[PDB]
Protein backbone atom coordinates (compact mmCIF):
# COMPACT_ATOMS: atom_id res chain seq x y z
CA UNK A 1 0.00 0.00 0.00
CA UNK A 2 2.71 2.68 0.60
CA UNK A 3 2.78 4.97 -2.44
CA UNK A 4 5.09 7.60 -3.91
CA UNK A 5 4.18 11.30 -3.75
CA UNK A 6 2.48 13.02 -6.75
CA UNK A 7 4.02 14.43 -9.91
CA UNK A 8 4.13 18.19 -10.56
CA UNK A 9 0.74 19.35 -12.07
CA UNK A 10 0.25 21.56 -15.15
CA UNK A 11 -2.38 24.16 -14.24
CA UNK A 12 -4.14 24.64 -17.53
CA UNK A 13 -3.45 21.31 -19.26
CA UNK A 14 -5.03 19.25 -16.51
CA UNK A 15 -8.04 19.56 -14.21
CA UNK A 16 -6.79 20.51 -10.80
CA UNK A 17 -9.00 20.83 -7.73
CA UNK A 18 -6.91 22.92 -5.34
CA UNK A 19 -6.56 22.19 -1.62
CA UNK A 20 -6.87 25.86 -0.69
CA UNK A 21 -6.98 29.34 -2.23
CA UNK A 22 -6.20 32.59 -0.41
CA UNK A 23 -4.95 36.16 -0.76
CA UNK A 24 -1.82 36.58 1.38
CA UNK A 25 -0.27 40.07 1.54
CA UNK A 26 -1.61 41.21 -1.83
CA UNK A 27 -1.11 37.96 -3.74
CA UNK A 28 -3.53 35.17 -4.50
CA UNK A 29 -2.05 31.73 -3.73
CA UNK A 30 -3.35 28.38 -5.13
CA UNK A 31 -2.27 25.31 -3.11
CA UNK A 32 -2.03 21.75 -4.44
CA UNK A 33 0.01 19.21 -2.44
CA UNK A 34 3.50 20.61 -1.84
CA UNK A 35 3.11 23.12 -4.69
CA UNK A 36 1.92 26.69 -4.88
CA UNK A 37 1.23 29.19 -7.74
CA UNK A 38 0.88 32.93 -7.19
CA UNK A 39 -0.75 35.69 -9.20
CA UNK A 40 -0.98 39.29 -8.09
CA UNK A 41 -4.66 40.01 -7.48
CA UNK A 42 -6.04 39.13 -10.93
CA UNK A 43 -7.59 36.64 -13.33
CA UNK A 44 -4.37 36.04 -15.25
CA UNK A 45 -1.66 33.35 -15.42
CA UNK A 46 -0.19 32.40 -12.03
CA UNK A 47 3.56 32.29 -11.62
CA UNK A 48 4.57 28.87 -10.37
CA UNK A 49 4.81 26.17 -9.40
CA UNK A 50 6.98 26.92 -6.42
CA UNK A 51 7.17 24.77 -3.28
CA UNK A 52 5.10 25.54 -0.15
CA UNK A 53 8.37 24.79 1.68
CA UNK A 54 10.03 27.89 0.22
CA UNK A 55 7.71 30.10 2.32
CA UNK A 56 6.39 27.86 5.14
CA UNK A 57 8.79 24.99 5.87
CA UNK A 58 6.96 23.52 8.91
CA UNK A 59 3.68 22.70 7.09
CA UNK A 60 2.84 19.04 6.23
CA UNK A 61 2.78 17.95 2.59
CA UNK A 62 -0.86 18.96 2.02
CA UNK A 63 -3.18 21.58 3.59
CA UNK A 64 -7.00 21.63 3.83
CA UNK A 65 -7.59 25.36 4.11
CA UNK A 66 -5.84 28.72 4.45
CA UNK A 67 -6.85 32.31 5.11
CA UNK A 68 -5.26 35.47 6.38
CA UNK A 69 -6.45 37.14 9.59
CA UNK A 70 -6.90 40.91 8.90
CA UNK A 71 -6.16 42.13 12.43
CA UNK A 72 -2.43 41.48 12.08
CA UNK A 73 -1.99 40.08 8.56
CA UNK A 74 -1.21 36.57 9.82
CA UNK A 75 -1.58 33.41 7.76
CA UNK A 76 -3.66 30.57 9.26
CA UNK A 77 -3.17 27.04 7.92
CA UNK A 78 -5.45 24.04 8.55
CA UNK A 79 -4.23 20.49 8.05
CA UNK A 80 -5.99 17.48 9.52
CA UNK A 81 -7.03 18.22 13.10
CA UNK A 82 -4.40 20.97 13.51
CA UNK A 83 -3.64 24.56 12.58
CA UNK A 84 -0.46 26.67 12.32
CA UNK A 85 -0.26 30.50 12.48
CA UNK A 86 2.56 32.46 10.80
CA UNK A 87 3.66 36.06 10.80
CA UNK A 88 5.38 35.82 7.41
CA UNK A 89 7.51 32.70 7.20
CA UNK A 90 7.89 32.88 10.98
CA UNK A 91 5.89 30.24 12.84
CA UNK A 92 4.26 31.60 16.00
CA UNK A 93 5.08 30.24 19.45
CA UNK A 94 2.90 27.28 20.49
CA UNK A 95 1.71 26.05 17.03
CA UNK A 96 0.44 23.60 15.69
CA UNK A 97 -2.53 23.57 18.05
CA UNK A 98 -5.43 21.07 17.90
CA UNK A 99 -8.56 22.52 16.24
CA UNK A 100 -10.25 22.52 19.64
CA UNK A 101 -8.03 25.40 20.73
CA UNK A 102 -10.07 27.47 18.28
CA UNK A 103 -13.34 26.38 19.91
CA UNK A 104 -14.27 23.74 17.32
CA UNK A 105 -15.84 20.51 18.72
CA UNK A 106 -13.69 17.31 19.12
CA UNK A 107 -15.63 15.55 16.39
CA UNK A 108 -14.49 17.94 13.65
CA UNK A 109 -11.43 16.22 12.16
CA UNK A 110 -10.92 18.21 8.93
CA UNK A 111 -11.84 21.70 7.68
CA UNK A 112 -13.07 22.43 4.11
CA UNK A 113 -12.66 26.15 3.64
CA UNK A 114 -12.10 29.38 5.54
CA UNK A 115 -11.96 33.14 5.01
CA UNK A 116 -12.42 36.44 6.79
CA UNK A 117 -15.75 38.18 5.93
CA UNK A 118 -14.82 41.80 5.15
CA UNK A 119 -18.40 42.90 5.76
CA UNK A 120 -17.95 42.39 9.50
CA UNK A 121 -14.35 41.21 9.84
CA UNK A 122 -15.52 37.83 11.21
CA UNK A 123 -13.96 34.52 10.26
CA UNK A 124 -16.01 31.67 8.79
CA UNK A 125 -14.84 28.06 9.00
CA UNK A 126 -16.69 25.61 6.75
CA UNK A 127 -16.75 21.84 7.29
CA UNK A 128 -19.21 19.61 5.45
CA UNK A 129 -22.75 20.99 5.64
CA UNK A 130 -22.14 23.34 8.54
CA UNK A 131 -20.03 26.39 9.39
CA UNK A 132 -18.69 28.34 12.40
CA UNK A 133 -18.17 32.05 13.01
CA UNK A 134 -14.93 32.95 14.78
CA UNK A 135 -14.41 36.39 16.43
CA UNK A 136 -10.80 37.29 15.65
CA UNK A 137 -10.72 40.14 18.19
CA UNK A 138 -12.02 38.29 21.24
CA UNK A 139 -10.12 35.35 19.78
CA UNK A 140 -13.13 33.09 20.40
CA UNK A 141 -16.12 31.48 18.70
CA UNK A 142 -19.44 33.25 18.53
CA UNK A 143 -22.67 31.89 20.10
CA UNK A 144 -25.28 30.10 18.04
CA UNK A 145 -23.01 27.96 15.86
CA UNK A 146 -22.50 25.82 14.03
CA UNK A 147 -25.29 26.46 11.59
CA UNK A 148 -25.96 24.57 8.34
CA UNK A 149 -24.64 26.09 5.10
CA UNK A 150 -27.93 25.34 3.30
CA UNK A 151 -29.95 27.18 5.97
CA UNK A 152 -27.80 30.24 6.48
CA UNK A 153 -26.29 30.93 3.03
CA UNK A 154 -27.85 31.78 -0.35
CA UNK A 155 -27.32 28.96 -2.85
CA UNK A 156 -23.88 28.01 -1.53
CA UNK A 157 -23.18 24.25 -1.82
CA UNK A 158 -21.97 21.93 0.91
CA UNK A 159 -18.44 20.53 0.78
CA UNK A 160 -16.79 23.67 -0.53
CA UNK A 161 -13.19 23.54 -1.82
CA UNK A 162 -12.31 27.13 -0.91
CA UNK A 163 -13.62 30.63 -0.27
CA UNK A 164 -12.07 34.08 -0.68
CA UNK A 165 -13.07 37.75 -0.32
CA UNK A 166 -10.69 39.86 -2.43
CA UNK A 167 -9.56 43.01 -0.60
CA UNK A 168 -10.22 44.95 -3.76
CA UNK A 169 -13.99 45.11 -4.17
CA UNK A 170 -16.56 43.54 -1.90
CA UNK A 171 -17.25 40.20 -3.57
CA UNK A 172 -16.94 36.76 -2.00
CA UNK A 173 -15.92 33.87 -4.24
CA UNK A 174 -16.99 30.33 -3.34
CA UNK A 175 -15.07 27.56 -5.12
CA UNK A 176 -16.35 24.08 -5.70
CA UNK A 177 -15.08 21.60 -8.25
CA UNK A 178 -14.41 23.29 -11.56
CA UNK A 179 -16.65 26.30 -10.77
CA UNK A 180 -16.88 29.29 -8.47
CA UNK A 181 -19.83 31.39 -7.33
CA UNK A 182 -19.57 35.14 -6.93
CA UNK A 183 -21.58 36.73 -4.08
CA UNK A 184 -22.10 40.44 -3.47
CA UNK A 185 -21.12 41.15 0.12
CA UNK A 186 -23.92 43.64 0.66
CA UNK A 187 -26.87 41.98 -1.11
CA UNK A 188 -25.67 38.39 -0.64
CA UNK A 189 -27.16 37.64 -4.04
CA UNK A 190 -25.25 35.36 -6.45
CA UNK A 191 -24.12 37.77 -9.17
CA UNK A 192 -22.66 35.05 -11.40
CA UNK A 193 -20.65 31.84 -11.62
CA UNK A 194 -17.81 30.92 -13.88
CA UNK A 195 -14.83 28.71 -14.56
CA UNK A 196 -11.76 28.56 -12.36
CA UNK A 197 -9.58 27.82 -15.38
CA UNK A 198 -10.99 30.67 -17.45
CA UNK A 199 -11.54 33.35 -14.84
CA UNK A 200 -8.78 32.60 -12.32
CA UNK A 201 -5.82 30.80 -13.89
CA UNK A 202 -6.17 32.77 -17.10
CA UNK A 203 -5.95 29.57 -19.12
CA1 LIG B 1 -9.39 30.94 1.87
CA1 LIG C 1 -10.08 23.19 0.82
CL1 LIG D 1 -9.83 27.91 1.52
Swiss-Prot record:
Residues 1-203 are annotated as: Required for inhibitor TIMP2 binding. Hemopexin repeats lie at residues 15-59, 60-106, 108-156, 157-203. Ca(2+) 4 binds at residues 19, 64, 112, 161. Glycans are attached at residues 116, 185. Disulfide bonds join 12-203. Coiled coil: none annotated. This is PEX. The gene is MMP2. The chain holds residues 458 to 660 of 660 of the full protein.
